[PDB]
Design a binder for this molecule. Sequence first.
Ligand code: ATP
Ligand code: ATP
Ligand code: ATP
Ligand code: MG
Ligand code: MG
Ligand code: MG
Lengths: 56, 121, 240, 470, 478, 354
Amino acid sequence: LLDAKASEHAARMTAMKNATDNANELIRTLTLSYNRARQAAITQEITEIVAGANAL
Amino acid sequence: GLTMAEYFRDEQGQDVLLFIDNIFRFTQAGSEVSALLGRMPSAVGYQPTLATEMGQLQERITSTAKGSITSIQAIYVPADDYTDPAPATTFSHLDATTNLERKLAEMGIYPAVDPLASTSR
Amino acid sequence: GLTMAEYFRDEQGQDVLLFIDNIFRFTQAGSEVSALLGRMPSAVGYQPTLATEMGQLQERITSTAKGSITSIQAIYVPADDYTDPAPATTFSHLDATTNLERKLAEMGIYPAVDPLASTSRALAPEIVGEEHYQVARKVQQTLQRYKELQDIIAILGMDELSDEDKLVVHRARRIQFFLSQNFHVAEQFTGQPGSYVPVKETVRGFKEILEGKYDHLPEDAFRLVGRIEEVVEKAKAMGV
Amino acid sequence: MTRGRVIQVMGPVVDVKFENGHLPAIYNALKIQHKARNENEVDIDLTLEVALHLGDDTVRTIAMASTDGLIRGMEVIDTGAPISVPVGEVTLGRVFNVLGEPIDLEGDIPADARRDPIHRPAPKFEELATEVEILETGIKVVDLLAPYIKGGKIGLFGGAGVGKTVLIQELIHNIAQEHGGISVFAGVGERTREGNDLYHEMKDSGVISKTAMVFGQMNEPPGARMRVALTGLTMAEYFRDEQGQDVLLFIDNIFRFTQAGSEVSALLGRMPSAVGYQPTLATEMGQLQERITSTAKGSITSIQAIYVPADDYTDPAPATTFSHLDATTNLERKLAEMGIYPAVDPLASTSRALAPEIVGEEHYQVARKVQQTLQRYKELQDIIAILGMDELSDEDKLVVHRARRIQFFLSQNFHVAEQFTGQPGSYVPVKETVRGFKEILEGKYDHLPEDAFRLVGRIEEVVEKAKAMG
Amino acid sequence: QVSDVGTVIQVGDGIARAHGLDNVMSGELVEFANGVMGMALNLEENNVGIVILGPYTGIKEGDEVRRTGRIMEVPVGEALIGRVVNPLGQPVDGLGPVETTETRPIESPAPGVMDRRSVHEPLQTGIKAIDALVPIGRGQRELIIGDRQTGKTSVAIDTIINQKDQNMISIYVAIGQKESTVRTVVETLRKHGALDYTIVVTASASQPAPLLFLAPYAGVAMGEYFMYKGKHVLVVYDDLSKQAAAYRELSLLLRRPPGREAYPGDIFYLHSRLLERAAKLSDAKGGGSLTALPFVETQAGDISAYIPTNVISITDGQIFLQSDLFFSGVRPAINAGLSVSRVGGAAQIKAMKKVAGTLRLDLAAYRELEAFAQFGSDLDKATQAKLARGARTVEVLKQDLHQPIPVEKQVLIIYALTRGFLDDIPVEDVRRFEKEFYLFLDQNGQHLLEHIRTTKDLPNEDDLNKAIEAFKKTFVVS
Amino acid sequence: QVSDVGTVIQVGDGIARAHGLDNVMSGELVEFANGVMGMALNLEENNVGIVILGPYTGIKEGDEVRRTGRIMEVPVGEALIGRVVNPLGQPVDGLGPVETTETRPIESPAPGVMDRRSVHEPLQTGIKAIDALVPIGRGQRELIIGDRQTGKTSVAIDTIINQKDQNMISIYVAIGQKESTVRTVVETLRKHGALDYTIVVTASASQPAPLLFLAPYAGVAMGEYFMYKGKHVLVVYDDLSKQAAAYRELSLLLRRPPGREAYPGDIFYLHSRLLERAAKLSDAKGGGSLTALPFVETQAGDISAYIPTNVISITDGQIFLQSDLFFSGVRPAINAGLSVSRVGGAAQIKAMKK
Ligand SMILES: Nc1ncnc2c1ncn2[C@@H]1O[C@H](COP(=O)(O)OP(=O)(O)OP(=O)(O)O)[C@@H](O)[C@H]1O
Ligand SMILES: Nc1ncnc2c1ncn2[C@@H]1O[C@H](COP(=O)(O)OP(=O)(O)OP(=O)(O)O)[C@@H](O)[C@H]1O
Ligand SMILES: Nc1ncnc2c1ncn2[C@@H]1O[C@H](COP(=O)(O)OP(=O)(O)OP(=O)(O)O)[C@@H](O)[C@H]1O
Ligand SMILES: [Mg+2]
Ligand SMILES: [Mg+2]
Ligand SMILES: [Mg+2]
């Protein structure tokens, strides 16, 4: 029973560490997606403003 | 409405209430009409004179020696985007906010004002 | 090409097959020409008359009382953005659509058809039969549940799922792999002859998969396989 | 007659009308010098740069200073040449603005001194050097793990307070002492108080006498901030071409140059590009960077500090800047607080020159072995923190023992650091660095204490320090 | 005939186009027929673009415009102290005329790089968090940035009030604020006596855009007069975002080409030109100084916008006020993780420099472990001590409105916190402990306070250790 | 006189506008009094829009412009082998003039549907990974795509070097590259003896945008001369991203409305027109071939960007170089999962297939 309890605690620790690493990787990819979206939004806004200015 | 309230504030020294059902529509109509007048567009299509018009409307609602006008204004936020220029320029004039929640109304609590969301200066 | 097809449709009353290799290039060329004509740009730089021009082109491709034209059109999606105005406006002109995804192609699943984005007006109980409709709806439901479980699987793994969800994932993997097929044209790439599968065989195979008859086979035996018996043959050849 | 006339003033943009057939060329400098005739006028002393020919004998220009007080009808004098700045020995130890007028209080340059235009085509293809060769800086970390190429561009990164200024001063001192060259500092968009602090730091370090400083402050119009880098580049080019020596060129921040160009383009009314930058971003960056090259006579190599907006390395300005870089130096606060200066990160720093075809086989092998040892030591950090030092195997103990000494040996005592510690400092050739690191890797000095390798220089000096410690 | 006289062609939205005015200068001040004033900004080939500095309802097409021949300028002098004026220098408090005898232009060159001296004199704001973690020196300009209702105006008022016993002159500039708030702020300053050395410049939201545009330049023009005389000036800008919006409106109405977010190309130049006039003059220039505290208002904490990025790049430091921290009860809600001062260290006295090092590390260690506090015991040897120390540190930095603290008391309380004398005091009693400790120091610790004031250094260690122990003997835990 | 002589009205950012030139034709070359060449782009009712192919600082309003009577052309011939030239064909290495006799237009129609043949001949690059996994045939268009500093140039240099013993003519086009890198590339090509059959066309980053825009067309026009004589040509475009950026700059200087990522509408047509000229000719037309290896630079490995997807939809396959594999010492860092050769397989020899 004591051996089983020790193994259970170690397994839970390892599983939580792996989950944290997976979450960090997901954040890493989401950051690149966010940067692309930000650049696209700025480009669209400035293009619309300039087109509206040129229409006059 | 404001000039009807100002008479009672000034000529009789009363304290009056001025209700505006959607202050966002004022800026929306200004933006709709600005384009045909020949003005260049602003950041997200609004009029360049948004802040000036909003201030000229709001600064007439003040407390004076004779009396006061206090205004309760219902505000619509499009798509719940508080960074939109019209809500952004409107919020700079507010002194307090009252938030109503359907959760409190379902529980039988009236007037169902949210105790934590509502804040005052 | 449409005029040549229309002659056969109308003057001879014959059945016509019409293939258009990329209808998006027509809209792209219109967009290129539009700026020099003096028109002010639209939302994403397209022509203001995008919808009108595309409708004028598309409405002529129809079946009439005198003859029938069935048309298959490939539509390019720029930068994999399905919300682009040109792909978005052309959706309303189609009776059946097939949506290809780069993720499925990268997974090695060909023809990489998205099983949930693809739609057709012919999927009705009175057109394809009750059994076909039920099997298709059940397959779509399982795939939707598997898509929902994706975040949990990605972060916490398969260990935290319940027994029902584990079986859902188990069968969804097999269903997803079985939708892939080996083409006759693709033989030049891989050297595999390819297969032709009748509709009833497909319905029976997916019905058997949904019933758990092949839960013991490895999921790799379902790739690019054709009929359901070939799955058993591949699994046996793999040493199962 | 070549006399202009002001017809439009709209902020920093001024339009000038000339006689037919006498328009100034593009990039020419125009001078406005007006003395007030009566009480309703203000004295004007302004310089303009020609940008476009609008037709009808009208020229659109951008001002290098404030345009307040201009009156339509003021006469404009065409100098017939672009902005010209003094060059030569006279510029050493002085501080200049974009126009080349001295900013310090030491007097003005005589009018008969030689002056060169700041606009110039890049050196021709046939005039470039055919071989790549290494610039020996005398710093062990740079000479070993991130070599500098003569004529190349090096990007410098790091947080505040890590010692970038000290590293720059040490580079200037070492190059001037050993290679006989000089340095030029270009403060593009620099804060005035920080510029004064930098000037005093150069002054009290004794290295001001071998460098020329050019400042463009943030309060200047966008046109002025765009051209200051060209002034510094021209001053460096004089020494490259006329004396045939190797010159250092330091740019305070090239991102500010990029944004000044964007602002100028917006003022001129051009349609923007990409995420809002000017359509000519790549062309302008290339025109600036292609003049920093190595020729048959001499070479200019540049150390540039780059700001990354919103931490996005895919932003157009950082991308077009990185397209030209040949090496990267990263400074880490952890090494600074650990006490190992110059605190250059041995793993984050990268160089294109670190190849066996350039630095040699033994140099490349030693560098790769050192990098592998440091990587293993970094990997072992969590194990040694949790499982304990005893749990590490014999190989792990040996690699930790070697890696600590290797890491400490990367530190060096700087000449300009004597003002902080009193230690004279040293200059280490690349061959000595390679030999010392190879000897350390072989275990020849495993018995010496680890703290004797700190701030040492050559490999004999660590033996002397160990003997002094007993 | 049109050398000094003009005729209006177009009127609208506060912008007028005039024919003639051949000899008008760029930026010159002009007068309309009905007495409303104007500024000439656009000098074009056949017309002049004039921005109207008042009510434009009375101006019609065909009206006559006369030029004054004077560049825009404001009155300066000691007579402005204790009065509320508009950006044109006209008093608005109703207390009568201002007796200034000289003027200087609003646009003037900044001091050169060789006219300055390194910042070395502290500016005591009276707020423990700012004076400890984000120090401000004389001649430094520091940005205060935050969302709506986070306490920026409270910080400005407190730091203005704290300058009573110091040879400091304060200028408060309100751009686009409500007139009621300005009236209440002026009343508070009068109540606390800060009006004896303070000048207030106001441009409310109902005012025309050019007044909002010109107000900060009037503020620096008024400050520079005292600066070049050898004195020290503090200038506070309540909103630069509203200045940017007003300038964008003016530029768009004049049909200048727009840039990102419709702002003009020279929007960065405007703020840099304004903020570079604050400096610490060298001894050859008289030794005067001017320090600036610009304010920027963000939307939902978005500091990635154009104007916030420009102002962050210009200034020497930032102070971030967090809405969630304010809601959580941490006030004045300064986020020490993001706040930074590039001049820090040199802008502190010796004792504060000695004591702030441990405080910074303790707060930094606590902030990262705060997310794990709700799960109880993680590592009772070290982590539990870190959590308690961080909680006590957070409790110490809290402060109330309009109660500035002298620097010596701040130094003593921070020393007591960092040396572990508060480790046994319960978290709920830290505020009362500090409040009673100040009274105890007033009653019995006069020698320590006098030594700190005279020498700017910590007293003998044993003396204040004994003093803290003696105070703790009397304190009762509730 | 006036029908062949013009007068400049406007100059700015490499764009000029001229009055006169009544008989000028669209796409014709024009010459300024300064000696700088230009291309007639727009023929308006009262003025002609001219794109300046060189330094525009020497051109002022009122300068004279004269016709040349020739549509855009570059010199071609065997005398151009071993030389380094600009997109206009002017020698740059300083070894003297080039004694060419013939010229070819910049814009030419691609071979028709019935003028082509299926690719059946291998192109041995000498790289094991490419020759084994992603075979390239003569007449194929193969895209090389990857991030910054992933070995794209080294692959092309090795491929050019490997053609020494094979009847292949190589053309290397560098668009927007640093001059020092081009100098070193020329030096190593000379060292390995590749200059006996190589032509180098260079347009560095300091050059004006029109030259960068025109360089690939000059390269392909030079290649077509050997292609239509029955020979085999290999053309390498060192960066199509630089050309796309230069064309975007040129279009926005003309105030044309941009699309996504500020690129013009015809950005796809720009690359398609260039890449459709590489083909394997049928036996009726001599059996010559032209092989193209365009380069595309990605940002953070994003293959879904606009320009990469535009180029992928044109070529017959792509070779993907991965940054992390390159950093981990795996060189060349070819990603086998994303790399594919549509035309390949039929090009490989029997021994390699097995
Ligand atoms: N090689 C060195 N030897 C000793 N001290 C050093 C060394 N390098 C840096 N320092 C220390 O670092 C500080 C100076 O840092 P420095 O001004 O060069 O950095 P920085 O990143 O340029 O700073 P800032 O951003 O404030 O301008 C001093 O405390 C100095 O003692
Ligand atoms: N230290 C503090 N302790 C307690 N309350 C505070 C403190 N600082 C500010 N407050 C309160 O916070 C509220 C808002 O403060 P303040 O007026 O300074 O905000 P602000 O950021 O200038 O916002 P705005 O000008 O947009 O209204 C007020 O009710 C004020 O009393
Ligand atoms: N197979 C290889 N083995 C060793 N080094 C290699 C190999 N291939 C390339 N390199 C080296 O990698 C570096 C970058 O390669 P290369 O210049 O060809 O890449 P690139 O993508 O064209 O770069 P850039 O964007 O700088 O033009 C060079 O130092 C080169 O020598
Ligand atoms: Mg420094
Ligand atoms: Mg406030
Ligand atoms: Mg390359």
